[PDB]
């Protein structure tokens, strides 16, 4: 049973407890917040959680990960300073403000014996194995992935902006499928602040490009669709994914075996326990390697659409 | 109203649906056909009773028709329209009309000097569907939209030009001429378009268009409002429009697409021939040209290139 530290007191907190409670894997032992009563407040529908308001006390306790969903200015301060101290770390998205961080704390966690791991949790999604498998033996010509829903110091702006909040979903879709993009572009509309409220991107591949949408301000219902020279392969969503289907240039359909894990974490949280249990090593890699690829891309996008 | 003697240059299955169209609106009748070879005007003519068969170009456009449609290959177009407007001949030209902007605005001068109509038969822009929509959105805040068409088949031209026109005709008729444009293509190594994405700038929004040959896209096309979506099944042959708000209620929009997919366009050509609203052609002509500017435009930045 893991001994699971937390810091940021959002809704999110609350849901990744939840999740972490329920795959039976995870024990919640400790919760740090900067105000004491923040924590209090917090933790208060939990039973005997130990609350810190020193990071450097917090992290001297006994427990062996700590998940953290405080604002993204802080990730990066806050993530070293657990490895630093000997924790596993899970990073809600975006994990860090730039590729860089990213890099250095992977140097920070192999140096400490520790594992990082970003919080992308369509990325550990069952249906993409299966989703990937069906597309092994066809020819991809292109793909139109989204994710747009309303919701009514810059940096953390920013992560909130449509494309660090919503469109990483997307392009954790892109990357899990087909790999590290070429290159990519973005163009948004953004406040006078330079945010943007929703914008078009697209994933450069070698022979073949993958358009991307992002909104806060607006809500897409499409769905997403991965073509190939046999037909289009059609998911409803490239996030909590329940369906894909296959249509053929005839019209004749397959429907590919997706079943929808009971909430929109539980994935990933029982992803995370099995790699601290039971080491997979090479996989391990290929997490972080597919995280950096995300971090270049939303970098990328972010220049390309002059958000700034 | 008399009914509207029609000449026919193009012998394709494209040809037969735009007179069976033009027949069964009851203001048009068949009498010319012409084609480079006069047996192929013979093979395609078989169906029809009582059909003139040109050999001649020149002598086709000064015979007794009234209108021409023309669907011969785009690059043949304006040569081909601008006798038959010299000739006093109304012209409706199959999309895309020209291959590049300024032909459009050069056969606009040679219709005027010689009083006649031209007509580009971009039939998904005469939709009632359009009107329809374009009501609706007359009360709202519009934040984007999301338009595609994109079709598989087999095997001046390509997705854009073929297909992505349909959109473009789209965001042209309900917002207007966009400020600027993009467009980021798949090619073959003569640089003619498979598929690709665009984005039409506006003021205060932006319009994702996609368009595809080698691809087949069943996406709805969708307006974003500040209070919601507005989803169509398509751009074309509209079936279905439906408003979805934050809260989720909807408002029905009463859309009902027409037997075939040309059935608006010839009636409204008719109509403009027989009871002429001048303020209407002229809002025809400049929509046809934004539509030309962006696909110019788009073409530039995607480095499609013909010939
Ligand atoms: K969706």
Redesign the interface.
Known sequence: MLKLGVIGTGAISHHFIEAAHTSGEYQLVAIYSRKLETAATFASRYQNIQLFDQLEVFFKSSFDLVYIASPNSLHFAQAKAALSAGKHVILEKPAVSQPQEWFDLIQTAEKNNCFIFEAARNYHEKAFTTIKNFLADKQV??A?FNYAK?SSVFSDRFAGGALMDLGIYPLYAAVRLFGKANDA?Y?A?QLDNSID????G?L?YP???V?I?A?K???????C?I?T?D??L?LNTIEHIRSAIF?D?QGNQVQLPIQQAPHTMTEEVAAFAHMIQQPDLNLYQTWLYDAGSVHELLYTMRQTAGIR
Request: without cysteine; aromatic residues 12%; hydrophobic residues 20%.
């Open positions: 010509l292109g139109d309303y572009t163009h509309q409220l929703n914008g078009d697209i450069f022979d073949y490009q358009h949408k909104g301000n607006i809500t897409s219902n499409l769905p669709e073509y020279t037909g289009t059609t249509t240039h």
